[PDB]
Structures are given as structure tokens and as C-alpha cells.
Write a protein that binds this ligand. Structure first.
Ligand SMILES: CO[C@@H]1O[C@H](CO)[C@H](O)[C@H](NC(=O)c2ccc(C)cc2)[C@@H]1OC(=O)c1ccc(C)cc1
Ligand SMILES: [Cl-]
Length: 137
């Protein structure tokens, strides 16, 4: 698939929706981003950074009216330059739950509460994208 890729989420997200993203990280990757969008707002930004001051970190945040909020940072970093990955995002009633390569990574409490209005997922960054899909579990 071509990156950046936009995956419509018809009628928005709902609990029990599972989004699965398969791809490969490019060699010498700098960043990956998943952006769950509510119009111009970003309800959930998931941003692995491969070199922030010589550290690897995942930054999560929300953008409202063009302003970024308080960052949530995770130092557990399961991505590897050059290697295939699987990201799964499970929507639960009170948070997005993220697993990478079948291991739980993090949860992100819902800041944007109109879940039905979060109707697009943007996938961008230094990856080759193989598949992006959703199902109900
Ligand atoms: C305070 O910096 C911001 O933090 C926000 C989260 O709080 C977003 O991540 C913004 N990123 C973005 O808008 C953004 C755009 C495109 C992609 C692919 C990812 C993130 C932006 O990050 C950056 O400017 C930035 C610069 C270099 C690296 C390596 C990572 C982040
Ligand atoms: Cl809201």
C-alpha cells in the first residue's frame, strides 16, 4: 500500500473494534505515526521515534484545535529498523489498547469522547505498509 495511507473507519470507532496494521520498518527509520482523526483534530496520535536525543521512545498525544496536549511517553520500544511488525489497536470502552507483535504495549485513555466521530485513521512514516484492516471481535 502507498504511504501515507488513509483508512476510513465508517461510522467511527466503537468498543470491540480491532484494527490490524502489518508492515516493515525501513532501514534507518526515524519515525512512524498512527493518527486517529476527528475532522482536523487528532484523537489519538501514536508516534514511535527512533532517535530522540539518541533514545527510542513512543510518544502518544491528542491534538485539539491545532494544539498538542500533554504527552504520554512509553520507553518500551518493540520496533526494529528493517524488521516486520504487527500493530493491533483494540478499542475498549475507556481506552485504546495497543499490542505490537502480539505483546501488550500501552493503553491510552480516551480524551476525545465522541468515539463515533473518530472516522479516519492515517498511517505515515518510515515503513513499507503491507495491510491495514479492521474487524469486530
Ligand atoms: C512537539 O513535537 C510534536 O509532538 C507531537 C506529539 O506531542 C507530534 O508528534 C508532532 N509530530 C508530528 O506532527 C508528526 C508528523 C509526521 C509523522 C510521520 C510523525 C509525527 C510533533 O513532533 C515532532 O515535531 C517530531 C519531530 C521529529 C521526530 C523524529 C518526531 C516528532
Ligand atoms: Cl469529544
Amino acid at each position: 500500500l502507498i504511504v501515507p495511507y488513509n483508512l476510513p473507519l465508517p461510522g467511527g470507532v466503537v468498543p470491540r473494534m480491532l484494527i490490524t496494521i502489518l508492515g516493515t520498518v525501513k532501514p534507518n527509520a526515524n519515525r512512524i505515526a498512527l493518527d486517529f482523526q476527528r475532522g482536523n483534530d487528532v484523537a489519538f496520535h501514536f508516534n514511535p521515534r527512533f532517535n530522540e536525543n539518541n533514545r527510542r521512545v513512543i510518544v502518544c498525544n491528542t491534538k485539539l484545535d491545532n494544539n498538542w496536549g500533554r504527552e504520554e511517553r512509553q520507553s518500551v520500544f518493540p520496533f526494529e529498523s528493517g524488521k516486520p511488525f504487527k500493530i493491533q489497536v483494540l478499542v475498549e470502552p475507556d481506552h485504546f489498547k495497543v499490542a505490537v507483535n502480539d505483546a501488550h504495549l500501552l493503553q491510552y485513555n480516551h480524551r476525545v469522547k465522541k468515539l463515533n466521530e473518530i472516522s479516519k485513521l492515517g498511517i505515515s512514516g518510515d515503513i513499507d505498509l503491507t495491510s491495514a484492516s479492521y474487524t469486530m471481535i
